[PDB]
Design a protein around this nucleic acid. Sequence first.
RNA 1: ACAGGUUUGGUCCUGGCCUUUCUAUUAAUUCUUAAUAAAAUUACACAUGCAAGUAUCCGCGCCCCGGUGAGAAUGCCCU
RNA 2: CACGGGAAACAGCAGUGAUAAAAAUUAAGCCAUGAACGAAAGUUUGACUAAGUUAUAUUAAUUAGAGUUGGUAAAUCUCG
Lengths: 169, 190, 292, 86, 77, 117, 16
Amino acid sequence: PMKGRFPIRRTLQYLGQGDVVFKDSVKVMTVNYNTHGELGEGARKFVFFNIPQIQYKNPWVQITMFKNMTPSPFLRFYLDSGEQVLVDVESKSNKEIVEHIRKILGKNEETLEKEEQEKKQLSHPAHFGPRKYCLRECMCEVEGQVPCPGLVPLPKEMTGKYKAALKAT
Amino acid sequence: SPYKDEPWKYLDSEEYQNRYGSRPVWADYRRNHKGGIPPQRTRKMCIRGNKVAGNPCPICRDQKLHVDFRNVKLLEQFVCAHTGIIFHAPYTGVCMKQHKKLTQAIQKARDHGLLRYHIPQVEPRDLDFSTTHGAVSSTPPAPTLVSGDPWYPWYSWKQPPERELSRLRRLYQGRLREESGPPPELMPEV
Amino acid sequence: RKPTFMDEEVQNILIKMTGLDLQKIFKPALQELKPPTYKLMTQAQLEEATKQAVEAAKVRLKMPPVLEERAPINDVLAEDKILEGTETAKYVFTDISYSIPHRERFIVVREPSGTLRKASWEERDRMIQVYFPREGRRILTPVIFKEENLQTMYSQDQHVDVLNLCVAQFEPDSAEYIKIHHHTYEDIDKCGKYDLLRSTRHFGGMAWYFVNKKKIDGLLIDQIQRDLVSDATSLVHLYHILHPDGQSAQEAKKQGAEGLHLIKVFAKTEAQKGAYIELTLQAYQEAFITHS
Amino acid sequence: LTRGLFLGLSRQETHQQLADKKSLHVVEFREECGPLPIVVASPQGALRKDPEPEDEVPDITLDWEDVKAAQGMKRSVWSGLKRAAT
Amino acid sequence: RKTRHDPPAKSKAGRVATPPAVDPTEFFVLTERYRQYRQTVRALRLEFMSEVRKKLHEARAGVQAERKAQEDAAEHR
Amino acid sequence: RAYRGGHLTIRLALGGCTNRPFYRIVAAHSKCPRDGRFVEQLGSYDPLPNSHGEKLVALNFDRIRHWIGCGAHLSKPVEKLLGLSGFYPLHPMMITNAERLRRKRAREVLLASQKTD
Amino acid sequence: MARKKVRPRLIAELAR
RNA sequence: ACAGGUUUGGUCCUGGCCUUUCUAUUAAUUCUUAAUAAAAUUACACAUGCAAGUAUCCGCGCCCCGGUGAGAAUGCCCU
RNA sequence: CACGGGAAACAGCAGUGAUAAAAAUUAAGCCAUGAACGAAAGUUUGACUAAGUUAUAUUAAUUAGAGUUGGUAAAUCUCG
Ligand SMILES: [K+]
Ligand SMILES: [K+]
Ligand SMILES: [Mg+2]
Ligand SMILES: [Mg+2]
Ligand SMILES: [Mg+2]
Ligand SMILES: [Mg+2]
Ligand SMILES: [Mg+2]
Ligand SMILES: [Mg+2]
Ligand SMILES: [Mg+2]
Ligand SMILES: [Mg+2]
Ligand SMILES: [Mg+2]
Ligand SMILES: [Mg+2]
Ligand SMILES: [Mg+2]
Ligand SMILES: [Mg+2]
Ligand SMILES: [Mg+2]
Ligand SMILES: [Mg+2]
Ligand SMILES: [Mg+2]
Ligand SMILES: [Mg+2]
Ligand SMILES: [Mg+2]
Ligand SMILES: [Mg+2]
Ligand SMILES: [Mg+2]
Ligand SMILES: [Mg+2]
Ligand SMILES: [Mg+2]
Ligand SMILES: [Mg+2]
Ligand SMILES: [Mg+2]
Ligand SMILES: [Zn+2]
């Protein structure tokens, strides 16, 4: 990327390196911030940097911006059970908010690592099929077993053409 | 050629040093093709029968070179020193028949330890080494196993009562087949 | 309470016995090379980077477990004489499930005689590899582990690689693993190539094998010639722990010395050839006094 | 092309010159050598004790061709062709 | 394979079936084996059925489930 | 595909090239094709002996009893295959075929010897 | 599933 | 893309066309054998044979398998 | 769409006419597997299995012809 102020924030690595995963009960995040004043530096930098990372990890969570409606920047979270979480940011920096958000509503490290651990067992190594879903495609790709007749031609005694010839004779 | 006894003798010979020198065999060979991009596949073979087909490949132009697993100096020239991967056919220019020979010879040589290749450090297969579990330790014999009796009563052959045989004969009369007795216990060999 | 390889006492002795050479433990391997990454660091940050490598080196130096020979499996679950000649080949059934550890899986073979018996260790490990493949393990026994091929690798001082192939291919408690490791340890002893496995993670295995075979004469001579004495006496200290009821360990309680005198105790008590040991220790002493 | 290549290569900055103008160590992290911090050049003279200011998001100019290739989107039929020796 | 609405063939329009012969002794023994075999498999099928009920019940309202539910609720407050 | 009815069944699905059969133990709706879509693949069954003279069979035991528990039908060969492993009692047709082999072999032995004398 | 161009077929119900 | 040919008396710049790489069908010329994979003009009209039976009568099954890409921006993912 | 009407159905395997630059056998068996039915021995199955045919592709070998030779782009002389 050439255009833009910070082209690095528009690459797949930057979108994927942000680790903030909301719980299944989080649906709506509303961010209000001001375009003037030194107090809103943390809020504006949070919108300019971290929000793309947050949305990429939570595709199903609505994120809506509102500019210059409240003198004090804040973040509002709407849960599934109607619960409202209000986060107040007036001097916290860009980094602080992400750490604060990750603790009130983010998922725990043990929960994330066990979630993908249970995902691994779906692609069981012992199965056969297409390359996109299974490792091997046939039993001939295992050393020791009878190889595919395409690569190594089979002995005549095992070919069905020879088997039928002797039965009819 | 009188070099089948020791193929590596030619590599240590003075003739090889005089001609090729320090550089590999395929250094002075250039492949003539149709334009800027060479075809991704070289000649299948250039030694068809007894006729040498045009400009030969580096290995098929001097017949004294033997592609075997004993000599490592020749096979080292076709393996990257740093990356440790086998050069493809377009990189050198050898014919496809000899390229297959090189890959098999290199693979055999690495299997015999004559050539060095990377060996990653591998963790042990299991986390806990316990032989206590019953999958590997011997389980107590079944009461029907020690006695020698079959595992189920109906596995063996039992003579039906004659009343039941008469009933079946009446039901399936006309289409009846010859009955048979108990099966032999052991089958002899022809 | 017999000594075991996992004890904290023996592990701490062997951890400082093998040493730590960053250059040798991190050697550029023959793989797909990628361009290096450069960054600017101060003096303080350089030590932080160095100590992280030390921690990574320690994890990379986890010695493989060493066990005794496994007992063969001879168990018959059931016998069926009705299927004596129904089939010619034998069926092998393997229970596959991602949740069951490989040590608890059921591998049961139906012999053509009709006997439902568990699979032996030789075939049990083969079946697990077939249905649960992993890097470095061949289904059939590679030709590299024949006696003829090992000598070719040994003549090319490939001892570190042979051990690394053996741990990946065979099971640590298997019979083939033991005979290959013992053969490798025997050969390096004959040629005095103990320097090859200095920073190698496999150094604990050969030291433990020597302390159980009562063959420390060769190893102690090399360490003194390498001017590594502080760890040399630790090796002698290890000997007393493993073999307490002996004349050498009795002297350590009688005389109650320290330093190089601990080697002198063994050199004159249980050492099979103490003439070289005492002379080399004498050679070290005079040289060290001159150096100091 | 000839003038541009020589002008660019003559403007190349070495590790030693970079270290001297920064007065900080330059550490080379080989990928095949693991996390071992190989040192290639040392700043002769005074060594600065003040660490470089760590920016969370660097401001650098990226070329779209480099990022496209890095993400695995260049699927031409001429980029990955096998060619002859150098 | 044919469909519902197509007409059948002409040559094979007279025959219906020709059951094979029945060995009296062999048929009775085979019938007896099946009666016990079906009985044994049915008990295993019901035993496996009860196992599935146990597994599903524990996943829904097991003791560990209540611990998990209370833990997240306690953390949220 | 939307089918009118059908029952869940554990069966063998053919595979491999000609003269080299290879069966996959799969569990799919009875009305779907033999190589068609399936619920879960359980194991494998190699019909040809290898260099060791073994016919490899793989079974997903904890999953196999799960589908049987929920009411899945079994075909003729999988019952014979499970019976050999010992998960199920020997199929009655497996024994009768064995007995027929002995009687045919016994007739073959007598017939050869009668001609000999 | 549905689309914005659904045509109200009536003969199928009439035949039923 | 590692690029190459071509504007002009001639140089630089801008800008098209084409070459070099791989796959499929048909055609021309040519052709010895074996094995494996695949088999494809046409939703045009069709001779003849066959493709759904089983079963102590009831019943169950009978484009399910298979075939085709005509139709519809149809749809994919998901509740 | 299919009550109805036109109208009298191979877009099941093999095969035929027409048409297109497009060219597989009017063949064998239910031995395996799959599906239907029977309590069951078992029966049916052009799905399939094993074969027939074709350089359409890949491999091995037993096999030798085609194209190009001003430049991009490997390569020639003598005549008309
Ligand atoms: K151009
Ligand atoms: K059949
Ligand atoms: Mg096939
Ligand atoms: Mg112009
Ligand atoms: Mg001109
Ligand atoms: Mg043609
Ligand atoms: Mg053929
Ligand atoms: Mg009835
Ligand atoms: Mg279809
Ligand atoms: Mg079409
Ligand atoms: Mg259309
Ligand atoms: Mg339309
Ligand atoms: Mg029809
Ligand atoms: Mg047809
Ligand atoms: Mg039609
Ligand atoms: Mg025609
Ligand atoms: Mg065609
Ligand atoms: Mg024709
Ligand atoms: Mg004909
Ligand atoms: Mg037929
Ligand atoms: Mg028949
Ligand atoms: Mg049948
Ligand atoms: Mg039934
Ligand atoms: Mg065929
Ligand atoms: Mg010509
Ligand atoms: Zn050649």
